[PDB]
Design an enzyme around this catalytic site. Structure first.
Site, PDB file in Angstrom:
ATOM      1  N   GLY C 151       0.861  -1.169   0.000  1.00  0.00           N
ATOM      2  CA  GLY C 151       0.000   0.000   0.000  1.00  0.00           C
ATOM      3  C   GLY C 151       0.903   1.226   0.000  1.00  0.00           C
ATOM      4  N   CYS C 152       0.338   2.413  -0.205  1.00  0.00           N
ATOM      5  CA  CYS C 152       1.140   3.633  -0.239  1.00  0.00           C
ATOM      6  C   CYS C 152       1.777   4.022   1.096  1.00  0.00           C
ATOM      7  CB  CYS C 152       0.309   4.800  -0.802  1.00  0.00           C
ATOM      8  SG  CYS C 152      -1.433   4.788  -0.332  1.00  0.00           S
ATOM      9  N   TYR C 153       0.970   4.226   2.133  1.00  0.00           N
ATOM     10  CA  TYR C 153       1.520   4.594   3.435  1.00  0.00           C
ATOM     11  C   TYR C 153       2.606   3.612   3.876  1.00  0.00           C
ATOM     12  CZ  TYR C 153      -2.082   8.162   4.475  1.00  0.00           C
ATOM     13  OH  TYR C 153      -2.873   9.288   4.517  1.00  0.00           O
ATOM     14  N   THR C 155       4.591   1.765   2.150  1.00  0.00           N
ATOM     15  CA  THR C 155       5.797   1.910   1.352  1.00  0.00           C
ATOM     16  C   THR C 155       6.669   3.046   1.881  1.00  0.00           C
ATOM     17  OG1 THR C 155       4.735   1.093  -0.678  1.00  0.00           O
ATOM     18  CG2 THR C 155       6.726   2.443  -0.935  1.00  0.00           C
ATOM     19  N   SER C 156       6.047   4.192   2.152  1.00  0.00           N
ATOM     20  CA  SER C 156       6.774   5.366   2.636  1.00  0.00           C
ATOM     21  C   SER C 156       7.406   5.164   4.008  1.00  0.00           C
ATOM     22  CB  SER C 156       5.843   6.587   2.685  1.00  0.00           C
ATOM     23  OG  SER C 156       4.833   6.443   3.676  1.00  0.00           O
TER      24      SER C 156
END
EC number: 1.2.1.38
Lengths: 348, 345, 348, 348
Positions: C151-153, C155-156
């Site tokens: 997911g995006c969050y 990954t960061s």
């Protein structure tokens, strides 16, 4: 709060229209909301629908069919088309009614069915309705019972054009209008088209050739001209919430200059608190009237000989809607027109 | 084969766009970049979004060595351009993004810019870089005057329609809208986020510097002096430009006729597309691409038509067209390094 | 288009995810879309769903049931949740599959049903699926058939935290994270909450204590710590279309300084094209990675002794989603990871 | 207007601060601006500087040195910094003064120098100044001649934290704060970093370890705790004009729950009109207080045992600045605190 309290009823308050009326009346010393309806949200607290108004003491929303008007003095109406005419037609006689919808705006009941998809349900009543463009029909509005509040684009356009046409300073041929509006004019409805992602950082025209406000605009221009006026109106959806700008590219009458147009608008609105003709060549910014009931305008000469350019801006939600509605009710109730409408624009 | 590129005046948005576009260009490689205020600094420090790019440090224009340069992209002030470009070596392809060599009438230049043209000789050989319209000429040119943004969005649809005599040259009313990126990176109160966001306003009323550039192109297409009404508006968005042209059609001509002529004129053009049916061009739909989307509609007023054209003011409206032109003048396919699709949402 | 074409299938392409995949593959010299599916938008032209891609030669949308994989090399999947598990479970074997949904991210079968309402419908397959955090599980991903794209969050956050935890440079206690994301992550679904008027010029937190990305993040951190990690994660919806920033407030191990953390991340990612540690005290801006597959990060000293602040930004739609999905397929197909992913950030 | 007029002077009115004061006082029945100063724009009409205020009757801006205070009762001050102390020191020993700068906010003069380089120029006056956090120091403010109006971030942070610390419901260790603010807080100064193109569609942290609001915040927290409080404060510049949100991640005292924190704030601000604790788990949106003098807050339990999450929002320009300044002057002049501060939020 001061003077004698005026019991207000807001019909169809779950939209931005209703939120604005609530916001504005919170600053009004006499107008007090006593009844609010929203059929899809009956039994709910308005603060639950609009979190920004949680501190306001308001009655719980009821279905319009259960609304009691026997102890109400005035009504602000914001219901769907067709349903509006039926409801207003049944309201009691002892009431001041300002309908924000377009249902009672067009005098030609046939012109209504053509543009709104159904037969006018209150033809008798239509003859009694008065178009709510305050500065223009003030006399008629003050002793009217039913006022049809103007649409936003129409308001921004008729304020400058009507007086100029009546004075015969501009021709009624080739009136080209490019209008721009913030997306709040599209309402709270859940639509893919109005998503932040589909709107932000970009613009686009819509309602090309036949926007529902065209007949409304021409109706007013034709009355001023005393002949059928056919305009070119192209609206554009801007990536901003509030604000509206209408640019009218007009052909001036023989011998008339841009300055002549400026001077006529100047003397026409010199005593008008909510319609202001800017100084010299100052350009009106929509950002400069946001949150106020003001209309700022100015006129410039066109590079093309004999032509002129008129720019008019308003907060589509205030002078273009709820602000003008309250202004009208103030007038209908015999109170100063600016009562509760002196909020200065929120900038930045 | 690698082509050594020089970028004069690269500290602005124009320069950033050139760096970004040439980053995905197989042949063009930046070897020199100038900037006098920010001379000596690393480009990645001026534009943190380009920190991964291997570029030379900015240098003063007076210290630039063009001897080993093949092509140049110019983006200098309203006057220094003519002088500097006049003194560049002969063996070089030059694409000037400024407006200094756009007007052919040396007189018209002084009128709209104050001072007299400082390179009338070069002006005669400069070629207007509206790719799709002057392709043949640009290909043979050494010095190309890259068109301005508004002018590009406007002449593409209007030039062919006027040549075909389908629309009249009388009462051409234009209302144009542009993102504020076109205002530059200069520190100004007027362009602050707070002074721009959530609002719009017109500017340059009646006298915008791009007016004569637009009329120049329309006039030659018409073979008569064309005087238009042009009103720009600064929009609260970074990229994007939309020009709306309200025109009167010739006798017996319909909006569809205009549509069909534009369709035929650009059917083979990759960067100029005529949308289908009555689909409306959104500026949001071309952001970050070198495309120009357009369509024509019937006006409510009999005999009139409405033309809408959009582009990314920074790409097809500037750097994109400049690269499109250099590809052309370097003998490479025009779309080389310009196939990025629009960044939406 | 360069030697050896790879036939791509995209299931569930009517959303922003699909749009991003199309944009990226048009830049890919080998990857070529041959099949695209949409449930309640089948038969339509993709250029009609997304006008910005009107110039791309793509196949018309078909029902997923009509997808012919016999001539398909790789598959990008983006479906409802639960529907994904089924479809993938019934897909051919000689296919490389990258699922962008959350269906195959969590190894704990009960933990999935506990955060997604229903039970895992492909428990056996779940064991074969590899977590798609490229830079962290490159060797596993390379030989994997089924890849669960992160997911995006997550990954960061994992990119900077995982190596630091493995190195025992920071403690797993009191890891406080405040993340901020553009509204594009909410999808193109018509919803009042995501309207321009409801999002523009404002921000707010959401999913307070209870966001689906938490177990995903904790799973990676716990694995790196070899102990159960419990974090504090609070996302915030920002008034911008794309971009994402995660701020991690961590406690450093005894004797460790912010610079120590900085040097470990530098050496960990020096040879990584898509994960860059900014120089000195440069602050990462989300605006600076928009449109690219980059993740910019930096670590700073906290005012509180023994603590540090780590900032990581990515474009939620690229490295946070479709960009990493493509990065993974490149790796799986034996192509350089940056293939079709060298687009520099679109700024301004 | 009504009830004896109070003549106001605004020193350093060419900024957003001054524009805001003008906007708010236009709605104030007693406060009337009679003097306005600005050096750079001295001699200009305020309407030329701020076109949104053209309908207002104001005096031309005058250089501070040419200012006449003989017919002024109270003064709002928004002078640079390093200039404020010297000017205020020289004002008539009979004027009510509300300084919006930070020059009189720090009681410890050594801290001022230790944080700003140069020495405090009016240490004697400093002992007399009262910190203007209205709901917290109401009694002292009532009797003060000179009030140091709180900064925006500190106001949003101390309202919730101070009461909780005094009640010893939360520990004073590991207080982690991530705050967000609209760019209007950066001022109208012509700066590249604050351009629409450099701000829009993006966010970034700033002032990492060293923001000038830190000592102001710690001063208030240390007083409440009766010990030196060292916090972690990280501000973020948001792509929005107005609005501010501070999220405080704190550790609760033994046996204390989030609900306990909620109930104490509920009890503390029950009778406070401008500090509202939302209901249930309602999340405060910055968009919901824009244009108003409100502070909306709520507290939630953290996923990490013993921790809690507090969110507080305000309009950085109103309750975070000019709104509170007016609130304080109302107390000092003996007028109802909410005089001219009842404007409801402008949403959408």
């Amino acid at each position: 709060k001061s003077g004698e309290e005026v019991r207000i009823a807001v019909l169809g308050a779950s939209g931005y229209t209703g939120a604005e009326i609530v916001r504005l009346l919170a600053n009004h010393p006499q107008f007090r909301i006593k009844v609010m309806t929203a059929d899809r949200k009956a039994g709910e607290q308005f603060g639950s629908v609009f979190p920004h108004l949680i501190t306001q003491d308001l009655p719980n929303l009821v279905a319009v069919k259960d609304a009691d008007f026997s102890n109400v003095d005035a009504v602000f109406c914001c219901l769907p088309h067709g349903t509006t005419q039926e409801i207003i037609k049944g309201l009691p006689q002892e009431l001041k009614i300002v309908d924000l919808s377009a249902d009672f705006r067009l005098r030609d009941i046939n012109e209504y069915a053509e543009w709104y998809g159904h037969s006018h349900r209150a033809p008798e009543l239509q003859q009694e309705a008065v178009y709510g463009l305050t500065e223009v029909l003030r006399n008629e509005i003050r002793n009217a019972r039913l006022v049809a509040n103007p649409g936003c684009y129409p308001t921004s356009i008729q304020l400058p054009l009507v007086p100029l046409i009546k004075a015969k300073l501009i021709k009624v041929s080739n009136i080209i209008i490019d209008a721009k509006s913030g997306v709040s004019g599209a309402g709270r409805g859940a639509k893919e088209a109005n998503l932040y992602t589909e709107i932000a950082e970009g613009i686009h025209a819509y309602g090309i050739k036949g926007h529902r406000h065209v007949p409304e605009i021409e109706q007013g221009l034709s009355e001023a001209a005393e002949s059928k006026v056919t305009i070119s109106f192209t609206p554009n959806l801007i990536c901003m919430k509030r604000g509206m700008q209408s640019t009218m590219f007009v052909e001036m009458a023989p011998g008339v200059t841009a300055n002549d147009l400026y001077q006529h608008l100047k003397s026409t609105y010199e005593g008008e608190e909510f319609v202001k003709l800017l100084n010299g060549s100052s350009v009106p910014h929509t950002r400069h009237v946001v949150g106020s009931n003001y209309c700022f305008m100015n006129v410039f000469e066109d590079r093309i000989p004999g032509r002129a350019i008129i720019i008019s801006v308003i907060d589509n939600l205030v002078k273009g809607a709820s602000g003008q509605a309250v202004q009208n009710l103030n007038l209908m109730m015999g109170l100063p027109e600016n009562t509760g409408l002196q909020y200065q624009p929120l900038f930045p």
